[model samples]
Target: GAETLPAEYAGGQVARGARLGMLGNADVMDAPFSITSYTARTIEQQQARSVADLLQANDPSVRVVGGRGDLVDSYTIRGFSVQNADVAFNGLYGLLPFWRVPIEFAERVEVLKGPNALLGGISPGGSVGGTINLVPKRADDQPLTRVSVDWTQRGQLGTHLDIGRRFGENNAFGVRFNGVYRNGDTAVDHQSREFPMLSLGLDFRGERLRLSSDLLYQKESLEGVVRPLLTGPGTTHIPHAPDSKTRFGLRDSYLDQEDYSMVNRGEYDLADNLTAFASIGGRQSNYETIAANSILVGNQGDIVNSLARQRGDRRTYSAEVGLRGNFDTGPLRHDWTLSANRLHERLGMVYAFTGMQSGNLYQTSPHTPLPDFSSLDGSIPKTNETDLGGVALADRLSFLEDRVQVTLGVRRQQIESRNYDQTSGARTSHDKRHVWTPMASVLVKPLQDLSLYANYIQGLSQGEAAPMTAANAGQVLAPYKAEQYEIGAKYDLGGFTTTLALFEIRKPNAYTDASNVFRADGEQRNRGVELSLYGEPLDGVRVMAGATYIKPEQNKTGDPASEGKDAPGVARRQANLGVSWDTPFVDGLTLDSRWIYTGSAYVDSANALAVPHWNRVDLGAAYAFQVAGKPLVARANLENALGKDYWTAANGYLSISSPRTLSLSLTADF
Candidate 1:
């Protein structure tokens, strides 16, 4: 029965690890790279609405830097930027919402650290930082129905329904549906958010074939969204962080997004030792936003604000086919796979902005005059088109009864991109580029409880386009490559698991040269060490802890002022520790707590302004019980329990933290 079901944790709700693309699901001790998978159980217990909320509390290597209340969700991982559009869904690229991804219909959030072109293909945004993959919820063999009602700080209320059933001879067919709606004011002043989502999953499992399909629709809107702050140029000192409840953005600003997506995947057994699989997916999105950008004018909380608005339609199509098999020759056994994939996207955009105005952070207002939409300069036009294709082959060789493993892989990729002038509707530039990326890994296990591994990988990014303000305005640079090297060790002692890793990554950086030429003539390098721990250490105690130290630098630069300086927005030290205790005294109650800390970081390339380090504390409790013969559960959590005020940087951008907030929820199963 366990073998027939999808991968799951052996004991606790948290999974031991995750599924590695093309390599299949494996335990933490068996994987050569550092990876983590947060299960749906974690989502429900934490009352997480989006991936950003989940990562903020548990993930040490991820930082949310898109700015407070900025409509988009962008992250910095391992000192590199991971764009929201670059996240993967069920091993496929570009199938989810582009701005923010809801966790209502997801079964798991899987994270892989480092460059991964050989494993998952090049990301559309050329993200060398890492990769995040979302696994959709699947129906089980048994019938089920559940409903939940929840409330967040200030006054946000939400409801969710999940239903599933299995039908057909031997229960081979299954279907699951989820629906959710929420709307209300947020913890921040004058800010509110609305989210509505619907999703359906279908699957058929047979002796020789397995097939699955998913459909999703979501709409999200926000009012009075908070925007990140930028330091004034040539400023000698960085501005102090404002109050946690301060809303730097105008009260009337808003953002709205709608998404529709569908995906299908299937696998068939060709023979006892061979298998074939294929998948195809597509998505369409409409995004519109009106927001403000802020620059600190002086040390007294005065800021200059610029208003802007943009609307866009994005369409994406992606597909993949692959085959895998096992074969042996002499004393070595080989596991190999071959895969081919393609992705295409087109975007139309229209935008406008207003002149700057002055405001004070300590003062609040909602009366900013709206810009005239009819007189906006730019009309919606096809702005960009992209096509990417790749073919890859990989093999894992085992020796000494599988105690030693060596893996090698290579991928040949091609990229085609075109940019068009908004007003003229004419192609300004087009690029066609091709490259080859290789991967190699080795694993050794001398003891049953310990494993050591090393790996080398590469990442590919699209060429840079010169900005309108650049001296060489229409010029386009060639595609660039990023490389990573890592070594790690894992220990599993039945009840607990621990990992230690050391890694280095390097990529080309872009800036304007002395001659006013904008080009990729500089370099940035990141070197770091990470240690992580997870699992039930004691009978009723669960723990998750990690610490990361990264030294990011501008190894090469066009400007002498920036050369050898610490890379902007990256913290030298970050740590998170969390614990959960099942209260034996209460028999059905559990208490949870966490502590997070971030070290000081530079705000500019010159390293003249710095953001001070800060810390936060969170506490929570939950109870599971039966009421009137029906199963019921309740949970409550308080964030920023100490009401600390501080600045946060996910990349190089700055945003103030939210004030103390509380969340409560109740669920009933029938």
Candidate 2:
């Protein structure tokens, strides 16, 4: 019943370890895969508003390929696009807000590298990229009552509150409440946003039974949100970069989203060394948008605007049950886990097309007349329904007095999906597949400060349906299984931790053969290397930095034109460096700065429409002092210090970089 959160590392900016899906938590030095768990301190210090900002600004392996002011914040991890549907909440899948994940309720943001079909089971989206997990806030040993206020020079004002209490014998019962409300115009002209969030966390630490409950409510809205720029067919000239204040949004464009989520978990100790756990969570989300997208036409910065009115409702339910225990098998120590997990989701949407109109990239696009389709009423028929379930078994065997560890794991997963014609409510497509994934890892601790490891694993994706023109039309192919191989080494120099790893992942591609039959007869192979170094490498210079290099390739696509071409929206090189220094002359004062760089990448599979490499530099400062007998911290940060204009994209949609911003916040704790 004692499943404690991992403690922060020496610098308090990162954790000592993170949850490894069904494999439980292991120190980075002992685990075979690379894991980065950023602490709440890091989150607050960076002032990250959403998951996209948290990872895109911090992790070298992550990029927000799409969705800045759009419906969902999407990402590319380890050179593969990851839909928001695949992110996990406290280890369960498909039970979070699909539009955006707020940071007010997060305690730890954990990122696990590489495919994990066996460790995590098949998520709804079945992405092959690494996994992201959110750990909610919990009460601490000391009572907390904190309030904060924030201001942005661009015209945003906000307030936040956090209250936590612990009672009972040995403070075994805990409760924490947090809320935030922010609203105002951003630096971008005519653009504004509103954020409202509320969360409550409760937990009980008992001798043999432990329980936790989390509840969340949030609604987010955006006015005049900017859309990505698309290249018009036959356009040869690249459009001139516009200033951050350039406006292309119509007056009536807007997006509103509301989400409700709840999660409950319980753990029971069955024996001295064994425990059983169960968790269930569900979420409901409502999203609506009336927006216009822009398409750049020619060198003179001309554009065409296309408007769309859309709304969607989504519901998700997820649960997991598991048992974990430790045993000794004649000189070898064993850690074993057996678990079952399931997730179900339903999505319904309604939309209307507003057609296209002429516009300029640097000017406002006028809003067109509204259409009369008043029958939506939020009763739209389901467009998609998906069910995913799996059972997993794994064991870790340790020898050489706990110096050598080997893990073997496997999972049997079943996925079923149905798509319906929205207008007539008729089934348009159906796919049901059962698949198996296997995993193995070997780790050797050569010394107290060094460790080496290797792993082999498989990731699963939903099957594809054959095209109508193919001989096997309507035939559903079996699920795709991706294979991955990785090797890494870790070194711990007292308070600092560093690691380097190399990996390769190959996924099958589907295409119609010369015989006019659909087949899974191609491959996409991505190979990469990662170097991570974090914590206080030296005495007073705190740091969080890393580098990533990847070769994203398409192979055996059955088409000679793109057989060896690079994938879309995947940069070949990326790097980040963040430093925080506590000045010896200025007591309770820290100066910080970060530089992020991303290499060039193509927007099309044909290796055309390339984006140039880009970089941004940011600076910040924080001072802690006593105000009226209460601890107070004032923080200010300036983003994009150089005011660089660049383009970034995911899923082939290119978005302009954000403008320079000045953010300030003050917090007091009693």
Candidate 3:
């Protein structure tokens, strides 16, 4: 017999009153696409410390490539690079390099795969394969309050609090508040961080209309250490090496960052069959970062002890407004949306040739106080300023007794940018251009319980005006567009849900040389298959497992400088497995364990170095005891149970990996 839906979602960790959807409308089971929804209960159960951690543990197809010497480390999703300066929220854009998201403020994290120009217009970095949307925690549910505290290895401590209340005779008005404070230091000495977040929300629901507003803020600080790189690429460990695991290495530096944002939405029931929605939101990040970069090397691939200390100040602001509506006419059901957005970004960088030593780049010895390039006064600097805007329209039409659906979307974007010489504040160059991206997809259901879909989509991102100059603005290169063809299937067997998809992504032409004179006209190809199975297959056993088989490669341009190159950041294979059990013998007690595996990937797009492959296992158990009219729950999680040695990303010069850790939580509510 098929089982009914559980009190909690198997794939998504959700909490009370939360709503699940594919994107904005289609519910989880009925949606004909491949998606991942992490519920609030999942958040609480896993006790996610950061967005990166959450994504890594779940989302089998999503990949994270980092260790690029940036203060906040960068990442790529699927097979495309997602730099710190490129991802956004809602319809806003511009880098959010180091913002920390509080779990208390998120109702769920929705991973919507495939072209999304319909929801978010052309991304600056071209999110052609998928988009991740964070649904905000709302105040439309029952009045409640909750608090939690936890401690983990390496002096880790955290506390979170949340509350909600309702007012008015019919409970038409509601307010919600949540806050968190966390501080920790890792096993690798010299690593310390602290983060605090706070948020408020209000909701008004009437007979024919609904309105909501939300405000959120986060402040984060970190004291970091740069461990020494001791081995060559493709090789895992160095038995004995300089800077032996015993010394604390790295130029001492500090980072202070904060993000403040607001989101608002309004909806009205215009008629018995029509509903309309309007939304507006924006976010800003104030960042201060200082770091050292290896600048020179000699023969034997050894480093010549020279490094530069670079300082930067960047500000990004974005604003957008859009409308979406759904209505039906006779046998035609219609879903349509239109939106416009504007973005402004400015960055200034100062580099100081701080120090030079007399050894290989990796073994350079240190000297007194750092070099002071500012004292020299004649050094030249670099700066970039840009203003951009984008507009889009999308529609979804269904017919054939509602068994077939078609979606169409298009976006137009404009960009104006200027570069200047920092010392003279003189404009050296500028550029302007316009680009358009389009997408289409079709879905057909051959059986009531199964769906088959296929789509063709394109992606565009801004490119440089010149090969090496800072002031040169980026324009649309006829060769920089990303295009893809995808096919997928979704099946629901009452108590079980499974999905399978095959995809191919390509980028036509890319500039690869230092001079603006040459074009690699290169192409990157990603062919992959994804599988996911969730829910119960047996009476008392629940299972959740997913995997992906990928082949990502890059073909070098005809030029020698770009010769023989393959796609730089994608891994060849990746997969994961998980299982859970809740039996009546224990009466409200559950036990679960999950093991994840990730394959090795090339660290750079040039495919010169490969990051090592890694695997981890997590264990969990939870028990609930009811006393009088209250329910008390206790849970524990043992992460990386076997203390596996893993490196997430690396080049011949540097590498970073997450270490084994543990966490626990307890809660009570009435």
Candidate 4:
């Protein structure tokens, strides 16, 4: 067993204290609860470029699946895959990343697996999978400053700066700072990108009191390759685009995405045994794109124009608070917390058109501009929405002489959404909804290092926006509801720990595209099992492995008998395993290798055709050498070591995966 707790955990606030997840608020070793925490050291060692890439490398339960938007890094958690625009950061409603979050500013990334209603509000969406919380690095004494540069096999370059300092006799005041500027081109042709990020924080400690606050900002320019269209009315047969060996379109065909946000997280110790934690954040994003439409690819007349362009802007803000304390009476002790939050979100998308099309025949080339469709050029009107969410929760428990203990929690939340304005052609703002959610959980600890937990939680999400029409747009549907059941176990063996869980989820209003009609319908079910193990497998050796199996289908078949098809884009089977080791013979020398596997998945309702199963292997090595009394680390990574050609998406519609890639990194700390 060899998971060495970082120096920060040795005597910090949580030393010997119950280990909490990266959120630093949730429990550890709860049955049905599985989380992965990636610390800054780990990130630098891994040479991770973005949060999404980090997950793609470490977590098997979640997958980032792209849509028509190539520039967007949209993803699917568990089974519910959505566009990048649908993801949330730090539990705050927001738009997709125009830029990726640089790894230097992150202290740890916590992947909270399974139901999250305990700390999050009702209806938080995931594939029964869980949530992702990016924990920012904090300030500390022992001032540290560093610079780093990375170069990959592909024409990619990344550079970063990290600085921190401490002041006062007791170092009562400490400051931490980080910044990154990066630009790169991908293995794919015509795909290039860049981004910038910055963060600053302060820490203050006094007798019986500690306080801290952090502010963060980031922005990026993303690029994606739009896949060739393959499906459309009156056509199902089209030649598959050449796999990784082939790529089309011009470099300028990319989307222009710009985004920036700020988060203020603060903690206050009211007493030696009492603390208050709060976080407030807000973000605004603009998504712009110009791309070829599907109508032009399918062997059919372009009923809708071929070339398309869309612009979307969104704004989100949220505030959350938690009060925690410890109570001890005689031989019994209690650890508890009370959490509450409020959130507001607004989003608007402007769908415009140049109304360009290809030849009238089924076979086509580059699209031709058409003046006849100019009548439809007027803006469809901006789509706007307002969401208000609130929650109150409490968890209480007691331990017998710090040995045996039981914990129980209850939480409730209310969520409301209303349209601020309707599309020029769609529904009215008056149509809205308000819903409530309730939840609970239980945990038992029989040993000082082991915990068993089980829980039943519910989830809710606002219905999709109604499209404009005489009787459609204004008729908003009720909130979609999902319920989950899970149980799991966790073991702490001094230096290392491991976890495993099984879960099931039920949904009432699952959107299905049956009978080839893309629409939201009633009644769907999803069930799955997840097994994860992580930590030091042996002295100087580390291992991480996990797998998930899911089966989803429509429970209520409507007009067609074939309506009960499996949900698209979800592999019934997925697995991941990683191994890392540090040299015992040499100081600060390490090597790591990992393998990822995803089973085949259905791409459409009929399940007639599917994306085949796929797997890949990765290898890396690094050495920490000293230069001028400063620690200088050098690393080399080989991704897709097997050079396997595979498709994670269904139908092989988009580029399946990037081929083997090699990257090298160098950093120095002073």
Candidate 5:
């Protein structure tokens, strides 16, 4: 029963709680904020290929934005964008892959539903939506060697191998290794993909010191990938979504990416009541793509397209050192922490684009030949460099036998950035500034089974640089900050948990004023309510359900036509439900299903075009048994089983829902 700990679902569908960045881990019943941890077992049952696949299945408030056969991952949480580059690895930022993160080596995918600048450091992209942290697999006491084979509806096949071992006296030293390979044609015509990943984890445990290190390498390539649809200028009506399996992209269009990274972390007990921790990590990445941008001419599927070829290289170095301690003052007990962190990045990029060409979305015949770009002789040039550093301090004070707790923290962050011309490598602009952001939260546990909490936090992102075409070209704007207010309540039902929350976030949006001066004069406000529940409500039934309703609008716009308009791409209502049942007659078989719904959203700032509401249903089943004394499991899943065809999202870019797809997998442990 070690694998079925009380902190997790009996079937390992989800964890009881998760880590809260610098504050460390806490139970869902006691934590002030809403958080969830999805177990790796859930990943295997769902046959998830990436973080997007996992979140789409388990997280209700999260939405996958640009993951339809694309090489990159993008998501929206609480009606705000959560940048791919900002996802943390083991609670440390800028250490994971820059574009895509594989799930093979992840032990758990933890989601914190709100701005986290004060808990974690400010993200490079300034994401105000939420934070996602990947916890790496560690070698457990039990030895394991699991191999799996999986097949997708489009003929794609994949193989994964996972191995783990513990060595030394008391099993103090441990290692875990994971490898994955997938390749073949996809559901979309002419689209094919190949992916490979390898990761190694090592750790040492001692009486007073613990150390861990992880190394990862991953590469992916996609041919004939589907591109986001774009509406042409002067179009009066929004075009209907094309066939789900249709491929409007050229066969020659492709994307390739490779990522390498290493991370090390250590924690030592300086005393019985104090601990010191430090971590350092680095990454190197390269990617190239030939993308086609299509503009719909009318509802009939005729389109105009432009092709762009781009290549980029990025390097990152990140580190953090912190100390935490517990002490008492009179009747109050304090848990305090002090931390310093630093991040550095360098980037090089090269790109070239061709003029527009005519095409049809329904064309099946051989398309026009792609233009040769060899004559362009692309040259990669240094494009950007950024340096970030910060120091933060916080304390949580408890009163009256821990019935009430208050947390207060502040971080002074510094940013230095420089931009270079693509062709000349000349430094066109530079910015350096420092600012302080603070956070406060209070929790009261009037009864052991009920908790109430409230929080106020500020979100910060890297400063913005005015584009060359702007009237204030080369101007470096100060870092943008978003303010959030939240109050929530949690109830524990012994075997299940439920949460209800209300929140509001407001920030200054940037836009061009009447005088043609680019400034942060526009205002955007998002207010919403969320209700969620997770756990086994009955002996044989498990459920994870949630609903969110938000009003995301541009409260003030420099352009009168856009004033008070709904923000493009943010739905007013969203909901998700996932359930699993273990049949009493079947000893080792389980049935599962999920339903997702997203309400309507605007496609343009003027709110002239809107995408209709859409929903999909998914079903899955799994059987576990022993094959010749070896643990074995077989799983089958049907995605979008209803064959729904609709526009998935149109915030700023257009994306369509995927067609019905099937996946099957078999795993054996030796």
Candidate 6:
């Protein structure tokens, strides 16, 4: 099957190979990390509604802050920070949707950039700044029906329906469905949103068994919600970014979310090179919030306000088992894998708050006395629990005729954690641990078109429990490890494909000393360089470009006037360029554009607050015809096409960016 699904590298908008969670699909000249796979026509020509708008409108080691104008999603790869419960689905890990994931029914959107815990496992918010997997949508072999409609920017409207089918016998049974509904007001300022989604897929194939299943549902609601701005206590005076719809929340804020999920995966074939795989999944979530927060203290933009009321719930369960193999040790040609996995989670919460009030950021903010979720419901008290699991092993060995390759691996992880006392429930803090992670890689192709690689990886997390304002208050440390080393080069320029990479990563840091004592002893290294280009260099042109540079530091922390310092929300320059064109003279017309850059950041680490350095551009066009016979498309887009006005620097949260947006769409096929 294209050697287990790995084809498309001719402007199908990516995928020369990917998915290495269990050492599954690898090509891109033998993958040794740093990967990409965006498709579904590049997520419907970048109409990408979330996955943080398909990686900040086309990746460059990603950056997506405050999920653009709201409804939760987070990232910051290659420079650290990652969350959304650490993404992954299809290659297992806690079944999606805690904060976001909506890409219609996503059909590929794989990205692996660093620290794969022995190829996927050990992530329940554990971050090494990388790894995201979401591949769903199956059932193909010919029949499908589609319909779509969309609008956004001030007045929203949306509708989508898709269906796919395959019969019993030789077609081997299959089905797929996706549905969605979307609603109103956005572009910020007195914000509003509502969405509902559903997805279902089923499949079966045999010759040696294969199966799949998925079910999901989603819902979200928002009203005057859009907030993230706080700084004043060491403030570094920076200001200028007032109209990107500016509005520091509070018009009786509100937000509600809902989720449900299911999954099943299987594979079998044990006799001609081995195979056996299995997976199972679960998820359930609920949330509510009535919130507001703002703090900027004087110097004209002034402000301070805080209020919150919350409720939360969660559940997750996951499982996996596996084996894969290929023979030969004779002339030395082996490729192997073994796996196991598990995940369990439970959490609950409750809250109420009010703390003074005052505001201005271009002025306007007054209201307090908000909270009433119809008697506030009930049942959300459990506080937290987690159990994660892992076991993995890997191998790959090649020689001469194969042009030399080597790989080795290991994984063994187990961690359990507990926390409680949401009032009188007791239990407080506990953690059990285990670790073993390793990886190594090398690949060489002494020139045919070039490729040379090197890799070493490790990642794991769960350490941090000395806050309560430090001084060793709770002290629970011990469980942090992340390391990476990389080297790369790939150049196959028949029609373009170029790459270069150099990397380094090291984590573990959590300061607070000078006798304030919160120790993890400091370490947060990062060294980076990346350059990339993909497909169609000319002839109707198509491209996806990249550039990244980083040097983040913060080492040895035993305070020396704050020693290393320079690691706060990263951003040591980043770049991306995307373009698409198809027109020698216009038939069916198409054109696209994208450019983004970021560079200036520091929101404290004694580097004293900062945020500046940004640029954005996006444009689009599309048209296609033939009606009564089906097949039609029309789309237009212009996102931030110069309405500019920014503030976005990752994890230290400076958010607020997204001011100009316009979109329209229509699609049909039957």
What TM-scores do the predictions have? 0.97, 0.96, 0.84, 0.83, 0.97, 0.33
Q: In lDDT terms, which candidate is top?
A: 2
**lDDT at 601, model 2:** 84
Model 5 agreement with the true structure over 195-283: per-residue lDDT tens digits = 89999999998888889999999988998767777876765666667677877755578889999899998889889889999999999
2 against 5, candidate with superior TM-score: 5
Provide the global lDDT of candidate 3 against the true structure.
Answer: 0.60
lDDT of 4: 0.60
The candidate with the higher lDDT, 2 or 6, is 2
Residues 343-450 of candidate 6: C-alpha lDDT, one tens digit per residue: 988988777666546767665355556655444466778888899888888888888877778989898898998988776779888888899998999889988778
Candidate RMSDs in order: 2.0, 2.1, 5.3, 5.3, 2.2, 23.6
Q: Give the higher-TM-score candidate: 2 or 3.
A: 2
Instruction: List per-prediction Cα lDDT, in the order shown.
Output: 0.83, 0.84, 0.60, 0.60, 0.83, 0.81
lDDT by residue (1-670, candidate 1, tens digit) is: 1013234453254576665665655566667888888888878877877888777778888877653356877777888888878888876788998888888898888788888888878898888898887888888787879999999978889999999999999989989999999889888888898989999989999997989898999988898877877778655676777677778777688889998899998889999889898889999988888888777787777888788877888899989898988899989999888989899999887777775778877765556887776543444678889999999999989899898999999999899989897667799989899899989999999889899999999888987888778898878888778999999999888887889999999989888887778899889899999999888888888888899999998999967888988898888899989888899999779998988888999888878778899888998899999989888889998888999878776434587777888999999999
Q: Is candidate 5 or candidate 6 better by TM-score?
A: 5
User: Model 4 misses residue 505 by how many Å?
Assistant: 0.9
Model 4 C-alpha lDDT per residue in residues 197-228, reported as the tens digit of each score? 77776676666455556666665555644444
lDDT of 2 by residue, 1-670 (tens): 1256888987888898887888877788888998999888877877777888778777899877544555577778788767776788777787677867887778988888888899999767868888888889999989999999999757889998999999999999999999999999888777788989999999999999999999999988988767787777765645655776666745567889999899999999999989999999999989888877777777588877777787888988989999999999899998999999988889998787665777887675565555554655557789989899999999999998989999999899999999887778888889888888889999999998899999999888887889999999878888888999999999989788889999999998788888999999878899999999998877668898999999989877777767889887889999989998888899889888999999988776667677788998888898999988999999988887788877785544577777787889998999
Better of 4 and 5 by lDDT: 5
Residue 140 C-alpha lDDT in model 1: 76
Give candidate 6's TM-score: 0.33
